[PDB]
């Protein structure tokens, strides 16, 4: 089967000169060198018989010291047709119920469990519901005042998302956190759907509680299941992106799966990992070049 490893810079550090390229694709005795983005992303096909570990190792090596990402994969079913991602942290600069916590001043007590949750150091569910609680008697302003005043969009996101609608892929935004947030950032960005878990409220505040049962890492696994069975797909066709340890069934489940700038225990457990490049990585994962993007 054949083999192709991919070279990835963060566009806004394109380190991934030509020079760098051609010693790259000499360090794995490769065939052809082609370039996706210039300085930012490069293809270089394996020669058959080299295992991926070797050639993974062997282009770390040489990259050694330099932000470029490095994944190899086969060439066929690169392009994916299902896109799930994560929101907070992925999507968006924030953790929308760290921000929150802000307008109840106890964001640190909140974002220091917020930490051991995306590292997997305790389970979602209660975790989430610790923190949730500690809203209680936020006015309902507080979210579009968050939305508004402190969340910003990751770089590359738009262009990911609308790239890949091009191309007739179908896109979910799928979210341990808050429908008031998913709603608002998928229409921002250009997702298909959203779904995330859902705040109550009496009318004017925060109960302090969520809506049961609490959308989790299984609730993850099932929302891709139930997207490709729908859109007349498989798992297999779908590229996962997240950055916490709730996202991790979802990465193992898809064809391609990436931990993105993931927390350090996440990003141990996936098979493949980003950790300079931003959200356009996962278009040079799947092969586009810039000349196919949407600008
Ligand atoms: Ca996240
Ligand atoms: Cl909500
Ligand atoms: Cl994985």
Request: glycine share 8%; proline share 4%.
């Amino acid at each position: 089967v054949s083999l192709v490893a991919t070279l990835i810079a963060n566009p806004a550090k394109a380190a991934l000169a030509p020079s760098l390229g051609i010693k790259a694709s000499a360090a794995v005795n490769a065939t052809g060198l082609y370039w996706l983005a210039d300085d930012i992303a490069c293809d270089i096909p394996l020669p058959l018989g080299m295992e991926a570990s070797e050639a993974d190792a062997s282009l770390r090596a040489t990259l050694d010291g330099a932000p470029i990402d490095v994944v190899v994969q086969e060439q066929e079913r690169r392009r994916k047709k299902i896109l799930i991602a994560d929101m907070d942290s992925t999507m968006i600069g924030q953790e929308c119920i760290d921000e929150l916590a802000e307008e109840a001043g106890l964001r640190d007590h909140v974002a220091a469990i917020t930490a051991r949750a995306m590292n997997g150091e305790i389970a979602f569910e209660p975790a989430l519901r610790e923190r949730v609680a500690l809203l209680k008697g936020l006015p309902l302003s507080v979210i579009d005042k968050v939305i508004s005043t402190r969340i910003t969009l990751t770089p590359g996101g738009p262009q990911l998302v609308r790239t890949m609608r091009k191309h007739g892929a179908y896109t979910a935004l799928v979210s341990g956190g808050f429908t008031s947030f998913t709603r608002r950032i998928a229409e921002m960005i250009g997702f298909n759907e959203e779904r995330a878990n859902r705040l109550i409220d009496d009318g004017t505040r925060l109960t302090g509680t969520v809506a049961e049962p609490i959308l989790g890492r299984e609730a993850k696994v099932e929302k891709l299941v139930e997207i490709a069975e729908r859109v007349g797909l498989t798992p297999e066709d779908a590229i996962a992106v997240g950055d916490g340890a709730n996202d991790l069934g979802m990465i193992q489940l898809a064809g391609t799966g990436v931990a993105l700038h993931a927390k350090p225990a996440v990003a141990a457990q996936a098979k493949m990992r980003i950790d300079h490049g931003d959200l356009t990585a996962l278009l040079y994962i799947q092969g586009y070049r810039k000349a196919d993007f949407v600008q």
